[PDB]
From Swiss-Prot:
Record function comment: Component of the large ribosomal subunit. The ribosome is a large ribonucleoprotein complex responsible for the synthesis of proteins in the cell. (Microbial infection) Specifically binds to domain C of the Tax-responsive enhancer element in the long terminal repeat of HTLV-I.
Result of changing K44Q: In a colorectal cancer sample; somatic mutation
Family: Belongs to the eukaryotic ribosomal protein eL6 family.
Name this protein carries in UniProt: Large ribosomal subunit protein eL6
Organism from which the protein derives: Homo sapiens (Human)
Record-listed N6-succinyllysine modification sites: K38
Compartments in which it is found: Cytoplasm, Cytosol; Cytoplasm; Rough endoplasmic reticulum
Cystine pairs: none
Length: 88
RNA sequence: GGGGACCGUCCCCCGACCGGCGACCGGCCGCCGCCGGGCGCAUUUCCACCGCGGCGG
């Protein structure tokens, strides 16, 4: 891997233009199991007990709530940017 | 005034023709599903409890 190769001068704005990065990056040459089987341990059984993970639920609630739409943001607190007052 | 014939219509048999088994029914083979009873009794399946457990609501 390499660095960003695009120094940022304003948040969301790169220094170099779209065509400038084409030359800098040199693109002109760089172009292009649910189920497991295990034996049972008894004769006249077959030893072919196929078991699946994530089995079907044994109970379903009478009503369910629909899922919410997507937000493309609202990061959890653990990854928020920590801002410190300049006088500190 | 009778009774017949004819015409139009239904009601019937009796055939033969096409279309369809339709939401009008059965019998047979096929496929699928379920139930009951056998066999299958154990790394399968199920039940219940515990963990200051992990995930989604």
């Amino acid at each position: 891997p390499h660095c960003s190769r695009n120094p940022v001068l304003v948040r969301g704005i790169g220094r170099y233009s779209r065509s400038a990065m084409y030359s800098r990056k040199a693109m002109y040459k760089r172009k292009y199991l649910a189920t497991v089987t295990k034996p049972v341990g008894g004769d006249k059984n077959g030893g072919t007990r196929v078991v699946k993970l994530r089995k079907m639920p044994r109970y379903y609630p009478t009503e369910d709530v629909p899922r919410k739409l997507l937000s493309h943001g609202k990061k959890p607190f653990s990854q928020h940017v920590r801002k410190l007052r300049a006088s500190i």
